Design a protein around this ligand. Structure first.
Ligand SMILES: [Ca+2]
Ligand SMILES: [Ca+2]
Ligand SMILES: [Ca+2]
Ligand SMILES: [Ca+2]
Ligand SMILES: [Zn+2]
Ligand SMILES: [Zn+2]
Length: 316
């Protein structure tokens, strides 16, 4: 769409009011011209054909309940873009300011969200297991990070490489949640999961075993479900990343924490410089160690903590 950039206002899934970047041309569209080649949000109108219609609104006010998921998808994509740019100096997912597209109201009662290789897609949930998935900034950022990984390391979606890919998305989804200071935690999906139950979440990075995911290499899942446990075995890496940041003692191994920022610098470097499509956990450890070495010196504490953390989860 060609038009005039403007700012609209609406309310997101959780009922919070926020301003969003729109474009005016007869209608007001969810098209943000302020970031790279643009952020565009589409209405999939409960169907599965994509992307759907670019979101159009008559008055630039988005307070209808049907508007909620669009407002958050649009807004959270902006935040995520900002995170990457400000923090890592990366312009969009491709490093070249590619447009970010998202569709909402995908299908009926769809309890999931995903990056399909070209764009983001968000279900509305069934209202019991989930509410519209774009209401979770960690979910939005987890999905957009899959695009970053696809353009960089290219980790295949299966077995260990796949679990690495998933862990990378949870790590950065959490870093973005802290960046925006939106009631941050080390849990994944807490804001849109089981609206009826408080205190739970989809996955825990601080304690993956809380929900039955492995927190040690010896406990990894070796079967075929979930593409070889990409969403299960990610727990091992997640735990490592939490320990590097926060510190702790895990299975008797003590880790001094070096904080979130360094965690992000180290993982971003590993991802973008050292990982390859078929990298395995042992390779990830070597990558993370080399990255910290690069950034902080081989005799640094940083390097030391990365080592301890992988030792703690049993990754050699
Ligand atoms: Ca309106
Ligand atoms: Ca949170
Ligand atoms: Ca979270
Ligand atoms: Ca819940
Ligand atoms: Zn994922
Ligand atoms: Zn996935």
């Amino acid at each position: 769409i060609t038009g005039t950039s403007t700012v609209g206002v609406g309310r997101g899934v959780l009922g919070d009011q926020k301003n969003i970047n729109t474009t005016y041309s007869t209608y007001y569209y969810l098209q943000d011209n302020t970031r790279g080649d643009g952020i565009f949000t589409y209405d999939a109108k409960y169907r599965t054909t994509l992307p759907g219609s670019l979101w159009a609104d008559a008055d630039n006010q988005f307070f209808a309940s049907y508007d909620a998921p669009a407002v958050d998808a649009h807004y959270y994509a902006g935040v995520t873009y900002d995170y990457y740019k400000n923090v890592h100096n990366r312009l969009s997912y491709d490093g070249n300011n590619a447009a970010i597209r998202s569709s909402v109201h995908y299908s009926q009662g769809y309890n999931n969200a995903f990056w399909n290789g070209s764009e983001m897609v968000y279900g509305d949930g069934d209202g019991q297991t989930f509410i519209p998935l774009s209401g979770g900034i960690d979910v939005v950022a987890h999905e957009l990070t899959h695009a970053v990984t696809d353009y960089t390391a290219g980790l295949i979606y299966q077995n260990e490489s796949g679990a690495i890919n998933e862990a990378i998305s949870d790590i950065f989804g959490t870093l973005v949640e802290f960046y925006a200071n939106k009631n941050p935690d080390w849990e994944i999906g807490e804001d849109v999961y089981t609206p009826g139950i408080s205190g739970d979440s989809l996955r825990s990075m601080s304690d993956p075993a809380k929900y039955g995911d492995p927190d040690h290499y010896s406990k990894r899942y070796t079967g075929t479900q979930d593409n070889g446990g990409v969403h299960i075995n990610s727990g091992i890496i997640n735990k490592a990343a939490y320990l590097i940041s926060q510190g702790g003692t895990h299975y008797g191994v003590s880790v001094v924490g070096i904080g979130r920022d360094k965690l992000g610098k180290i993982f971003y470097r590993a991802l973008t410089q050292y990982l390859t499509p078929t990298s395995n956990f042992s390779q990830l450890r070597a990558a993370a160690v080399q990255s910290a070495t690069d950034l902080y010196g081989s005799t640094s504490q940083e390097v030391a903590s990365v080592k301890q953390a992988f030792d703690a989860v049993g990754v050699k």
